[PDB]
Each structure stands twice: as structure tokens, then as C-alpha cells.
């Protein structure tokens, strides 16, 4: 009750929290833009009380068996109302022929209702928050989703999200069904895409990527049918569910003989054809990126992008097109098909440009 | 904390918990400041038509709205305006009212700001022409009534952080303070 | 219809400079895939015997125990990997460790001042007797049946010339080392390999007729045994490009810039092997191939 | 100045000098722990 | 089938900080307006200033496949062959129309008269070209 | 390669020529400001030793990718430097223990985190009422503003609140009620404080 | 203290510290020579002879088993 | 065990399919796609990585049709084999030399 | 100063990234000392291996 | 001023 420190500021309109985490951040573009990366220690730390259906009855009676020791697991029961049978001073064998009947018989009809709950490890399906002090604007609080990763103790996040937590920070876990709605669904990065101080989006590629798009998209690119498919194949990855079609499409040579070639264009256009949902046409664009076209030589019009039914034809890739920029290639995108279409292909975009850039690197010398 | 509890009403007003209005659109357009960023960029919405069409399901949105009343009051209030927009600020009386304050924006389709019309007729009278306009129109009036805030924002606490978060990296140095 | 017969048709070796520690064999006619593929096995999959489990009875040197069991860690030894077998890893201690699937290793030195010493000596060999530890310091005490095997097959140190530890007087060191098979990716040190890295056959492509002394000039920027020049027409010309490192010097002249494009030809890899003492550089580039061999035949194998 | 005239007096303490609104009055879901009034909270469900 | 023929007296080539590609400022022989503007990748086909070379727009070649035994198309008979589709049509002047095609971000300009250019339309043009 | 155009430290690519040359030739290089005039640059200096040693002029040694093995599209620019360690070398979780029976604060001591004040109107921000709820947690009906729970012999626990056998004299309107345990704390400041307020306690 | 393994390439450089002092030393000559005699080609194994402080010589006579 | 495929990306008639494998990498998937490019029936062939930390591999062909995508793969690693084994015998006369 | 003179080519830098490297050497895992067998303190952090810098500023060996 | 003073690599396998 006092000027600053008093009781409001301090335990009313704030508080410590439970099931809560703190780390520092390693950036990873290996991972979608919408997950998190979340060490193995964390994972046998932070558990969610969830009950126990008769339909998820095995996927937690493993969890149970699994226990601490391995992710994912389960730290303890919450048979009936308390009575936290604990898993941690426990035997393999004990678990066993114990945890094994989570769904009891009946056996009293005073709480017939709430079956029994067992608190399990976070896996990779749930979502988290992540604060990063200052929180200026409520932009600096997201959603993610959970990517176990049985590696080195440190957040992982993608490059994209750098724009917005202006990037150590902090993690929240929820344990109600509906905070777990709201984070995936209002608080989730990808409806974030856009800023309400302008309405201009904040999220993209930076800085490694925009220089590879720039190296790629170039008219001095040329790709055989081998690295063609492995760079499509490395950037999509259609068993993850990026794309519905079920079978990869590519598309015909840019050059038949002598042998056949493709274009770094027309990889980003076979990227946004296989990205595109089926049974909707192409996205048709005009604008213009950050480089003049005399730095080309005569003769060229690279300045300006033009796509044309979901292809593009002339110009070049660039920070305004991709990245954080208004009026850009992936803001169009996002226009078109919804936040979610619009935040794969930064998240594809982002996978292309870190093994393109493995094959052939960017180095800046002396000389330059 | 002034504007902890300002909150877009269920009504185009914005209004606390105790319902005190503050303002009854927002900021005369109801427009939600993110789903924005496109409503005067004709050209390319009138380009991916077809993809805008499905996105915009038009065959589920007809049964739940009308627009024949609130298009011709607008067609009337655009009419008198044009008529009258010659004389100046305190010389101009109300016959009609915008249409946002006669229907409910989200509801009645061709309920749109006065700004939005005019940019509108201004950007159809250019001739080069599926490209129908009476389809167009169709088209650019239902993106403005999906455009709308949803009740329940928290705008008020969305506008102080607007102000406040820019204003860090604002100014550092150099008459007027 | 490319095919196996093919790629054995155009495919040849041509070794350079072999010797008992270094290999300088060339590649032609095979795709950079597979000699990467090659460069990876050599350099991480090829098994190897390094120090590993190291118990201390007593140390008191200036040098951590930690730093010390990881310096006796990266030690070459020199026992041929096929001759011991890997650890299930998920046994009892005593369980854990056979006559034929690891090697035991003793230090036990203790350091003291010798009373004869010259005057104004500061060398500490003379000063103090085991002044200094050394690898050779470290004895192979077999168990079982490693002692008939290992009878042809001491268990020395690939160098035993290498500095553990320094001491002094009053100054002891006794430890216990438990050496067993490595995969190389686990740690560097099970690295058979010092370096298993190649290079492509750089091609140089002369347009202009370079003659006179602009062409000596010319001869001058490469290494001295790359470039010829042609007697018969004072024409410089190709000699040896193995000779030559990739260093583009000709190109900061502007008068041979146009002259010559620096190429590289795509499909002769100067592969270059050294080793520690444990195995040739030929038999570990023999176990690369066969390890790549057994993934696929595994590979095949296991269904799906 | 301003805090003065509003009605819910929780918040004014929460603010600067939560001594003097506590004498007139003899976020506030917040102090009580009661659901908000705002998104999701906006609303009520049944049924 | 073809759709436009012609050859054309390459004025000049310029790669214009390019490795690769070169801009070829092609001139039709034959008619005394039609004017070509290229850029290929002179690696895989090199040219050279003041040059004539065959020109042809096929519509198709008698889903993609790499060559199989016993298999024609027009690519056969040519040398070097570009794939792609238009994206531009301009009215230059009175009996000057100007097609602009795109080959993979390589554009092709090419200038005539509506009756000899009428065939063109905005769809895929396989463009062949041979020495 | 990025770092440098927004650094601007030229000092990291002189100091890679350098110790490359260093390295090569031997010697020990000397990096003392104020002795490279303009008309004699510490790039060309270097360059020579490295020109006469046989690398690259500038540097750019080509090297070979790890994974596909083919040779990159440029020479890479590398050197040596001095590399230094630092001792900023961190993390903290809790699910449950120690705990107006809010968590304790440190890392050491198992505590939480604090979500402040910012972070709440961040939540709010979104909308997300279920969120902030969870993120800032997870009575006497008739007084509305505690005394209860005093079984006598084997009777179940009731409620005697003096401030209200079967109600003695106290009363029997009470029933459990979900609010923070801050309030409780509050509630006994008050009544030392000597302020009480009438708590609309809602109906059932 | 002399790094056993080269860290960057891997070519054992422990024992060919004392040579790379006697060579120094006993006959005169310089760095570069010095190593390139002791057999060491690439500036990843050039280094961890080149420059390495014996912090064991001074860091040493500070024993507390012997009477000062 | 050590390969599996993915149910999920399957093909109805199996033309088509992605394969996951353990324990391997760039190592093994840039030999592996090779060689079954080599193959002319199959219509497209590459390699995928989840996480580099992770030691997965995941490899995707999708054949010409006429030929099961599982047989496409087993006709690569023979083909492998051979690749791996044809070196050993060349190499091994070299060191007779 | 002297930790300012100790860093290699301080003309080719930016003031502020001299400031920050300044800043920064101070923060290192350094060498304290030898006689750390007995100088019984909080915190030492002391680094196993260091080497001489190969591009060392003069007077890096006067000091 | 007097400029700094001046001071008076195989491939593999050479
Ligand atoms: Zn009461
Ligand atoms: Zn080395």
C-alpha cells in the first residue's frame, strides 16, 4: 500500500508464477516460425495436467511408464482431488502395474464425475508464451509451438521473430484448455503479422537470407535438374504438411538444350506454386525492390518484380519484397491467402535460403 | 491504466466496463487498423479477383444480410454530398446522415466511410475495365464489412501502446518542445 | 543410360605419393558426391582406439585432473582397430570391460630432486630426475588373453615423444587409463585422420598466345612448377596443374585478366590423407569405402 | 487529476497515492480474480 | 507448330555484370521494323557481335520428361532452345506492336506489325533458336 | 560477413591479414596505430608478405562446402584473429514449492518470474481473458467482507463468523468462493487499517 | 601446457615443442625455418608453436611440497 | 528400425513416397540421391534433414510410375554397393603398382 | 590508455567499438595470476591455454 | 615519415 513498491504494484498487479521458464535465445532457422525450441531439460520439468480420456488412454499409459526419466513423460497423478501420487520416487516396476490402470471401475459414486488426471511432460502439439522485457507493445508477447529438441539447454526461435521481441527471455506455460485456444488462436505469431501503430508488418528474413535471395533470384543463377529437386525437396518437405497435394510439382526447364536448366526465379515460383493452396489461381503483383537497374548494366529492368499467376517473371527478390516491408511480395501473400499461407512461406522461404546459402556461401573480403 | 478497460462494444461505440462511450465509431471508420493495409490498393485487388472472390466466400454471405436499403441510402447521401460540396464548412446542414451512423456497418453491406466512396468512384472512373463493376463494387464493399473490428477488442489499450512503445526511439536531440 | 560399367569404364586412380604416413592418391571420372562422401567417412566414421575412462589414484601436479585426462585422452596410440570390440554401454562396470574390447594403460610417476646436480643449472632434467612426463611413460599392463595376442603388438604410443606433464620435486602423478574403440564423430579424438581433406584439379584456360618476356612474366605469378615454357615458339603453356594452389594472382594484372580464365576442372579430386600411427592412410581409405559399403548393404537389408 | 472522477476506485489505488482513494471510497477483476470484461471475456457462454 | 520466323543480324552483345547471361540486341534481316532484344546465358550458347542466327516461337514440340530414346521435336532440329511465356503486349505506334516475353526472369522484347505478329498471344512459346 | 557494414570495424579484417602472414612467414606483426600512412596501406603491406608467401593477395582462400562437398561460388575471406572468452557464460524453471503465498523471487532459491505490468496489459492487449487469468493465478455471504471451519466433536466444519450450535452469535451463511490469497492478506490490512468497503458478495 | 592436439587441423604438434626450443636455441636460426624444418606446412599447426606461453615454468615453482 | 516411410506423404499406388532413415546425413543422402538420379525411371529424387541436431534423414522419390518408389530405392543401393565396390578392386591395383 | 593501446589497428576501428572492446576485455576470462595455488578468493576465472597474439600491438611486451 | 619497414606454401602433396 505504499507510492511504488506498495502491495498493488507488487503482488496485485503482478505476481510470480508457476510452471514458468527463463533462458536465453539461439537462433535456428530450422525450426517453423510458429515453434520454439525447447531443451530436453525443460521437457522433464514442465508438465500439464491433463485427464485421462478412453481415447488417449495408452498415449498416456506410455507417458506414465516413460515418467521423468524419459521425454516425454509423466511427473506425477492427481488421482481424484489431491492425492498427487508422485512418479519421481519410483520404480520402473512400480509405475508399472500401477500407472497401467489410469481409467479405474467404478469405485465411488461421491466424485463420479472428474475420472482421474495425470500430469505428462510438454510435447511438441502444446503452445507456449514468451516475453521479452521491456514489453512495449503487445507485439513483444506471442505464442509459440513446442519443438523438443534432445540437444544443448537453450531457447530456439526463429530469425523472423526478431523484428518483433527487438531481439534472454522468458517462457509461460499454460495449463487451461482455454488459455492453450487463446495463445494458438489470438495470441499466435502468425495472426500477429502485421503492427497496429501502421499497420506495416514486422516479421521476415533479415539480413543472411536477403542477401542469399539477392545471390539467387539473380539472372547469373542456373541450376541443373538434381539441384533443382533437392533445393525444392529441402525448402518444402511435404510429409510435414506444408503442402496438401500429397505429390510434389515441379516444373518444365527454362533451357531444354544443350542440357536442362532451371532459374533461381523459377525455383521461387515452383516454391509459391507448391505453397499455393490447389483450386485457386496465382498471385499477379507489381512493385519494385531497393536496387537500381543500372547497377545491372544496360538493358535491364530488375528494378521492378512482376508476378503473373502465381510466377515470377522479372526483377529480383529483395528486403522490400521479403522480409519486413509494406506492399512487399509476402505481404501481398499474406493479403491473399490469410496469415497462415503468408507465414509458411516466410517459414519456406527462410529453409531455401539457409541451404542455398550452405551450397554456395556469402563472404565479405578485403578486396570488396 | 486509464484505458485499461475502454473496449469496442458490441454497438459501433466504444465504451468501459461501466458503458460510458467515449466515441461512437472509431475514428469515423470502424476500420480495424490491421485488416486495413489493402482497402485502397485497388489495382491489386482487383487483380487475383477470383482468389479475393473465394477467400470472400460471396455464396454463404447472402443469407444472414441485406444491401438494396443501406446502398441506396448511401447512393442518395453520396448524391446530396456531391451536390453540396461546393459551399463551405458552417453553410452545409445535415439532410442525411453517413451511412456508418444510419446501419450497422458489419451488418448492411455498402455501409462504408465517406472517404472509401470517394477514393472508390475516383479510382472506377478510369475506364480499362469478372471486370464488371457492379461486380467490383460487390467485391470492395464486402472486404470493407470483413475489415471491421470485432467486439470485444482491446483498443484504447492497443492505441496508448501505439503511442507509447514508437516514442522510445522517438527523438534523442536536435524552438518548440 | 549412364551405368555401372560406365562409371568403371571412365573411372581411374592415380596414386602420387604414397607413404607410410601420408597418402596423395587422385580421383577422376567421380562425382563430387561421392568423394565428399568419402572425405566424411575417412575424417569421423573410421574406428579408432583412443584413452577414454581415465581413473586417478593420485595426482597432485600443478595441471588439473580434468586438463590432464583429457590431455592423455588426445594421445595416438597404435593398435589397429580390428582387434578389439565395442562396449554395449549398458553393462555393469565389471561387465563393462573384456580382455578384447578395451586396453589398460598405468602412468605412476612420481618426480624428486637428485642431489647431483651442476652448479648454476637450470636445465630440470638435471636438476631433478622425472622432471618431465612423457608418453612413452605409458605402459600397456595387458589382461588374459591380451597377452598372447599383443605379443607381436606392443601397445605404444603412436608418439611417444608428446609432453603429458611437467613436474617437480615432491611432485607424484598416478592414474589409470581405459582406452577403447571410437566412432570419431563422438569425439575428435578418435580421429585416425588428421585431416582426410582434397582438392580439384585446377584448370587453366590460356586463350591469348602469351610469348616474349611478358610471357616469362606470366610464368613468374604461378608456382615455379606449373607454368612451361614452349622452347620451340617462346609460347608459355600448361605443365603440371596439380603444382599449383589456387592463388589468382595473374588476375590482379590487367593485361592477363582477358588472357586467361582460371577454371577448375569437376571431376579430379588430389585427395590428401595424413594419419596418426594407428593405421596407413591406404587401410583407413580401404575401411572408409567398406564402412560405406556396409550402410548400404545394411540399408538394403533392414525393411521397411 | 483525471483518475479522480472515474468510478472503480481499484484502479485509482493501483495508481499513484493509493492512500487518499481509499479514504473516499468508505482491473478490479484483476484484484478480486475475476474473469475479465474484455476479448473472450467480452461475452458469456452456456448451454 | 511455329508461330514467327525470321533471322536476325545480332548487333551487339553486352553481359553488363553478368557471368553468364549477355544482352544481345538482335535485328531482324528481312523486315525493316521487327527488332529483337535477348539475354542467354552465352556458357551453354555463345555469341558473338554483328552474327546472324535462326529464330522460331513454337507453340509445342511434335508433363515434362528428360529425352528418351527415339524421341523428335522441333528442339531437335534447332540448337538451342528457351522456354517461357509472355507477359506484355504494347501498342508502339500504328502497325508497331511490341510482345514482351520471359523466359525464367530472362525477358525477351520483340517489336513488328499486327500481321505478322498476330499468331503471338499470352500463353507458353517455346523459343528455339539455332545457328 | 554481415556484421562488419553496420560495426564498421576494419580493424577485424587487418588484424585476419596479419595474423595470416604472421602465421605463415613466422614473424610477430606489430599493430600499433599511427604508423600505416595512406600512401602505405596495411592492406597492400600485408598483401605483399602474403604474395611472396604464395596465398591469396587479399586473402580470399577458395575453399570446398562440408555438405555437398562442391567448391563455393567465391573465395572465402579467412584469416587468424585473437578470439577472447568472456564470462557471461543462466537458466531457471519451476513447476511447484517454494511460495501472500505468491512464489519466492530469485534463481538460486527456485523462485518464479515476475509477470509485471507490462506483460499484463500485453495480455490484455490481445484480448486473451483466459490467458491473463491463468497468468495471474491457476466468504461471508451475508457480512460480504474471515471466520469459519470449527467442528466441535464429530460434526462436519461450519461457520461461526462472529462479524455475522447452528449459527451461534455468529451466523451460517458462508460457502467457498475462488479469489487470490493476496485478497485475504489485504482484507486483515484493511481491518488493522481500520477501512472497511462493502464487497458485493454475488449471489450463489 | 603445449596443445597436444592442433586444434584447428589435428597433426600432433605436443612433442615437437622441446624440439622447436633446442632448434631455436642451440642453432640459430629463425621462426619460419625453425618450423618449417620441425615439419609444420599449415598455419592451423603453425600456430600452437608459434605462440605458446609456457605458463607451466612460472606457474610451477610455486610448489608447496618443497621448502622454498 | 533404421528406415521407415511415411504414410502420410504416400502415394494410393506407391509411385510416389518419402522414406525416413536414422542415424545418417549429408554423409549418406548426397551419395544416395546420385545414384538414384542415376536412374532415369524415377521422375524425382532428393534428400531432407528435420533438424540438424536431430540424426534423421528424409528421403522423398517420386518415380515415372510403372515402378514401386520402394524398388526405385533398393535399385539405388545396389547400385551403391557396386559404386562403392568397384573402387576398392581399382584402387587395390594402383597399390600393386 | 593501455588496454586502449593494446588493441590491434585502433585507427581502422569505430570509436564507439574501441569503447566496446575497452568495455570488454575488462569482462574477459583472463589470466590472474600464477600464484593461484594459494590466493584463496571468490572468483578467479582463470583460462587453461592463451597464447601471444601473432598481430600483437607494440608495447603488448614493454608492459 | 619512413614507411614501415619490409621484412627480406605447397600445394598438397609438393
Ligand atoms: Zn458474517
Ligand atoms: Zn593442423
Known amino acids: 500500500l505504499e507510492k511504488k513498491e506498495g502491495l498493488f504494484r507488487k503482488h496485485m498487479m503482478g505476481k510470480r508464477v508457476n510452471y514458468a521458464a527463463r533462458s536465453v535465445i539461439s537462433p535456428d532457422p530450422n525450426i517453423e516460425t510458429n515453434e520454439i525450441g525447447v531443451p530436453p531439460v525443460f521437457a522433464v520439468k514442465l508438465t500439464y495436467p491433463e485427464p485421462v480420456t478412453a481415447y488417449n488412454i495408452a498415449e498416456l499409459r506410455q507417458a506414465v511408464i516413460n515418467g521423468p526419466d524419459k521425454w516425454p513423460g509423466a511427473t506425477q497423478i492427481q488421482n481424484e482431488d489431491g492425492s498427487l501420487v508422485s512418479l519421481i520416487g519410483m520404480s520402473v516396476e512400480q509405475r508399472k502395474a500401477l500407472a497401467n490402470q489410469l481409467l479405474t471401475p467404478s469405485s465411488n459414486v461421491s466424485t463420479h464425475t472428474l475420472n482421474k488426471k495425470v500430469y505428462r511432460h510438454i510435447k511438441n502439439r502444446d503452445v507456449v508464451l514468451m516475453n521479452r522485457q521491456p514489453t512495449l507493445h503487445k507485439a513483444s508477447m506471442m505464442g509459440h509451438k513446442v519443438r523438443v529438441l534432445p540437444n544443448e539447454k537453450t531457447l530456439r526461435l526463429h530469425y523472423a521473430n526478431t523484428g518483433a521481441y527487438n531481439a534472454e527471455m522468458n517462457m509461460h506455460f499454460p495449463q487451461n484448455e482455454n488459455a492453450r485456444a487463446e495463445a494458438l488462436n489470438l495470441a499466435n505469431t502468425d495472426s500477429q503479422y502485421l503492427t497496429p501503430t501502421s499497420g506495416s508488418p514486422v516479421r521476415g528474413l533479415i539480413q543472411d537470407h536477403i542477401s542469399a535471395g539477392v545471390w539467387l533470384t539473380s539472372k547469373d543463377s542456373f541450376f541443373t535438374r538434381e539441384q533443382y529437386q533437392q533445393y525444392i525437396y529441402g525448402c518444402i518437405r511435404p510429409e510435414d504438411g506444408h503442402t496438401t497435394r500429397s505429390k510434389i510439382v515441379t516444373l518444365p526447364p527454362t533451357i531444354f538444350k544443350p542440357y536442362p536448366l532451371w532459374t533461381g526465379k523459377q525455383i521461387i515460383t515452383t516454391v509459391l506454386l507448391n505453397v499455393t493452396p490447389p483450386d485457386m489461381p496465382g498471385i499477379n503483383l507489381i512493385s519494385k525492390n531497393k536496387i537500381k537497374n543500372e547497377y545491372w548494366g544496360k538493358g535491364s529492368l530488375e528494378n521492378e518484380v512482376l508476378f503473373k499467376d502465381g510466377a515470377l517473371l522479372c526483377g529480383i527478390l529483395d528486403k522490400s519484397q521479403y522480409g519486413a516491408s509494406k506492399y512487399g511480395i509476402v505481404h501481398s501473400l499474406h493479403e491473399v491467402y490469410g496469415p497462415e499461407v503468408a507465414a509458411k512461406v516466410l517459414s519456406v522461404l527462410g529453409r531455401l535460403f539457409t541451404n542455398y546459402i550452405t551450397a554456395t556461401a556469402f563472404t565479405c573480403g578485403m578486396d570488396d | 491504466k486509464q484505458l485499461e478497460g475502454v473496449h469496442v462494444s458490441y454497438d459501433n461505440s466504444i465504451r468501459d466496463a461501466d458503458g460510458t462511450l467515449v466515441q461512437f465509431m472509431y475514428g469515423g471508420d470502424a476500420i480495424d487498423i490491421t485488416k486495413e493495409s489493402h482497402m485502397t490498393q485497388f489495382e491489386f485487388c482487383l487483380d487475383n479477383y477470383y482468389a479475393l472472390l473465394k477467400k470472400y466466400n460471396p455464396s454463404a454471405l447472402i443469407e444472414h444480410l441485406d444491401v438494396e436499403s443501406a446502398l441506396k441510402y448511401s447512393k442518395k447521401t453520396l448524391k446530396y454530398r456531391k451536390k453540396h460540396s461546393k459551399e463551405p464548412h458552417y453553410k452545409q446542414s445535415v439532410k442525411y446522415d453517413p451511412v456508418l451512423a444510419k446501419y450497422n456497418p458489419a451488418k448492411y453491406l455498402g455501409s462504408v466511410s465517406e472517404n472509401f466512396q470517394d477514393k472508390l468512384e475516383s479510382f472506377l472512373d478510369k475506364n480499362s475495365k469478372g471486370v464488371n463493376e457492379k461486380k467490383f463494387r460487390a467485391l470492395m464493399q464486402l472486404k470493407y464489412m470483413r475489415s471491421l473490428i470485432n467486439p470485444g477488442e482491446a483498443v484504447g489499450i492497443i492505441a496508448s501502446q501505439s503511442v507509447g512503445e514508437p516514442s522510445t526511439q522517438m527523438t534523442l536531440n536536435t524552438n518548440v518542445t | 543410360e549412364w551405368n555401372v560399367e560406365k562409371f568403371k569404364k571412365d573411372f581411374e586412380v592415380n596414386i602420387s605419393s604414397l607413404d607410410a604416413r601420408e597418402a596423395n592418391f587422385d580421383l577422376i571420372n567421380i562425382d563430387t558426391s561421392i568423394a565428399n562422401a568419402f572425405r566424411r567417412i575417412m575424417i569421423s566414421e573410421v574406428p579408432s582406439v583412443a584413452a577414454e575412462y581415465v581413473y586417478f589414484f593420485n595426482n597432485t601436479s600443478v595441471i588439473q585432473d580434468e586438463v590432464l585426462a583429457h590431455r592423455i585422452g588426445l594421445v595416438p596410440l597404435k593398435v589397429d582397430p580390428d582387434m578389439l570390440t565395442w562396449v554395449d554401454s549398458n553393462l555393469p562396470d565389471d561387465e563393462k570391460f573384456t580382455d578384447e574390447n578395451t586396453i589398460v594403460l598405468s602412468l605412476n610417476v612420481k618426480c624428486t630432486r637428485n642431489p647431483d646436480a651442476p652448479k648454476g643449472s637450470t636445465d630440470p632434467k638435471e636438476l631433478y630426475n622425472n622432471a618431465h612426463v612423457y608418453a612413452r611413460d605409458l605402459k600397456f599392463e595387458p589382461q588374459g588373453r591380451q597377452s598372447t595376442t599383443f605379443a607381436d603388438c606392443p601397445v605404444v604410443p603412436a608418439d611417444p615423444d608428446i609432453l603429458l606433464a611437467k613436474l617437480r620435486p615432491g611432485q607424484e602423478i598416478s592414474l589409470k587409463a581405459h582406452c577403447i574403440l571410437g566412432i570419431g564423430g563422438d569425439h575428435a579424438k578418435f580421429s585416425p585422420v588428421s585431416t582426410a581433406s582434397y582438392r580439384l584439379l585446377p584448370q587453366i584456360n590460356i586463350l591469348q598466345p602469351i610469348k616474349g618476356e611478358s610471357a616469362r612474366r606470366f610464368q613468374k605469378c604461378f608456382p615455379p612448377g606449373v607454368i612451361g615454357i614452349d622452347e620451340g615458339s617462346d609460347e608459355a603453356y600448361v605443365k603440371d596443374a596439380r603444382k599449383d594452389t589456387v592463388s589468382r594472382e595473374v588476375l590482379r594484372y590487367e593485361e592477363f585478366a582477358d588472357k586467361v580464365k582460371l577454371g577448375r576442372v569437376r571431376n579430379h579430386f588430389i585427395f590428401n590423407v595424413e594419419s596418426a600411427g594407428a593405421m596407413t592412410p591406404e587401410e583407413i581409405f580401404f575401411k572408409s569405402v567398406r564402412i560405406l559399403k556396409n550402410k548400404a548393404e545394411y540399408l538394403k537389408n533392414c525393411p521397411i | 487529476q483525471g483518475m479522480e472522477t472515474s468510478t472503480s476506485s481499484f484502479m485509482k489505488m493501483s495508481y499513484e497515492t493509493t492512500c487518499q482513494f481509499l479514504t473516499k471510497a468508505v482491473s478490479a477483476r484483476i484484484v478480486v480474480g475475476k474473469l475479465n470484461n474484455v476479448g473472450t471475456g467480452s461475452f458469456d457462454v452456456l448451454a | 507448330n511455329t508461330l514467327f520466323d525470321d533471322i536476325f543480324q545480332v548487333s551487339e552483345v553486352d553481359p553488363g555484370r553478368y557471368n553468364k547471361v549477355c544482352r544481345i540486341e538482335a535485328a531482324s534481316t528481312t523486315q525493316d521494323q521487327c527488332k529483337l532484344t535477348l539475354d542467354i546465358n552465352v556458357e551453354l550458347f555463345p555469341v558473338a557481335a554483328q552474327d546472324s542466327l535462326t529464330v522460331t516461337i513454337a507453340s509445342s514440340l511434335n508433363s515434362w520428361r528428360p529425352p528418351q530414346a527415339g524421341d523428335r521435336s522441333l528442339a531437335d532440329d534447332y540448337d538451342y532452345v528457351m522456354y517461357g511465356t509472355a507477359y506484355k503486349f504494347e501498342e508502339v505506334s500504328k502497325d508497331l506492336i511490341a510482345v514482351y516475353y520471359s523466359f525464367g526472369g530472362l525477358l525477351m522484347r520483340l517489336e513488328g506489325n499486327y500481321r505478322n505478329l498476330n499468331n503471338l498471344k499470352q500463353e507458353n512459346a517455346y523459343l528455339l533458336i539455332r545457328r | 560477413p554481415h556484421a562488419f557494414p553496420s560495426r564498421m570495424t576494419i580493424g577485424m579484417f587487418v588484424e585476419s591479414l596479419a595474423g595470416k602472414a604472421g602465421a605463415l612467414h613466422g614473424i610477430a606483426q606489430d599493430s600499433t596505430p599511427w604508423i600505416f600512412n595512406e600512401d602505405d596501406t596495411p592492406a597492400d603491406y600485408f598483401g605483399e608478405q602474403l604474395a611472396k608467401a604464395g596465398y591469396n593477395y587479399h586473402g580470399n582462400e577458395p575453399m570446398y562446402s562440408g555438405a555437398t562437398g562442391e567448391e563455393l561460388r567465391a573465395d572465402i575471406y579467412v584469416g587468424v584473429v585473437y578470439y577472447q572468452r568472456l564470462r557471461h557464460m543462466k537458466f531457471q524453471v519451476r513447476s511447484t514449492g517454494p511460495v501472500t503465498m505468491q512464489p519466492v523471487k530469485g534463481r538460486k532459491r527456485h523462485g518464479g518470474i515476475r509477470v509485471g505490468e507490462m506483460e499484463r496489459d500485453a495480455l490484455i492487449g490481445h484480448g486473451t481473458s483466459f490467458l491473463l487469468q491463468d497468468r495471474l493465478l491457476n466468504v461471508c455471504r451475508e457480512c460480504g467482507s474471515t471466520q469459519q471451519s470449527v467442528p466441535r466433536i464429530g460434526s462436519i466444519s461450519t461457520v461461526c463468523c462472529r462479524r455475522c450450535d447452528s449459527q451461534i452469535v455468529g451466523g451460517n451463511e458462508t460457502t467457498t468462493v475462488a479469489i487470490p490469497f493476496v485478497l485475504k492478506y489485504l482484507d486483515s490490512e484493511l481491518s488493522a487499517m481500520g477501512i472497511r468497503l462493502r464487497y458485493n458478495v454475488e449471489p450463489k | 601446457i603445449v596443445p597436444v592436439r592442433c586444434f584447428s587441423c589435428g597433426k600432433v604438434v605436443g612433442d615437437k615443442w622441446e624440439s622447436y626450443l633446442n632448434l631455436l636455441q642451440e642453432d640459430e636460426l629463425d621462426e619460419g625455418t625453425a618450423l618449417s624444418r620441425l615439419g609444420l606446412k599449415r598455419y592451423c599447426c603453425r600456430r600452437m608453436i608459434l605462440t605458446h606461453v609456457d605458463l607451466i615454468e612460472k606457474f610451477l615453482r610455486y610448489n608447496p611440497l618443497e621448502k622454498r | 528400425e533404421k528406415i521407415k516411410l511415411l504414410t502420410q506423404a504416400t502415394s494410393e499406388d506407391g509411385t510416389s513416397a518419402s522414406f525416413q532413415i536414422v542415424e545418417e546425413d549429408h554423409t549418406l543422402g548426397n551419395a544416395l540421391r546420385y545414384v538414384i538420379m542415376k536412374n532415369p525411371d524415377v521422375e524425382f529424387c532428393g534428400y531432407s534433414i528435420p533438424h540438424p541436431s536431430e540424426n534423421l534423414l528424409n528421403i522423398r522419390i517420386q518415380t515415372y510410375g510403372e515402378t514401386t518408389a520402394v524398388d526405385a530405392l533398393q535399385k539405388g543401393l545396389k547400385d551403391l554397393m557396386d559404386l562403392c565396390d568397384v573402387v576398392e578392386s581399382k584402387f587395390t591395383e594402383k597399390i600393386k603398382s | ?63 | 615519415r619512413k614507411d614501415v619497414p619490409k621484412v627480406e606454401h605447397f600445394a598438397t602433396g609438393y
Open chain 9, 1 to 63: 590508455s593501455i588496454l586502449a593501446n593494446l588493441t590491434p589497428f585502433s585507427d581502422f576501428n569505430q570509436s564507439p567499438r574501441n569503447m566496446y572492446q575497452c568495455q570488454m576485455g575488462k569482462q574477459t576470462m583472463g589470466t590472474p595470476g600464477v600464484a593461484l595455488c594459494h590466493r584463496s578468493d571468490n572468483k578467479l576465472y582463470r583460462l587453461q591455454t592463451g597464447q601471444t597474439p601473432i598481430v600483437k600491438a607494440n608495447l603488448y611486451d614493454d608492459y
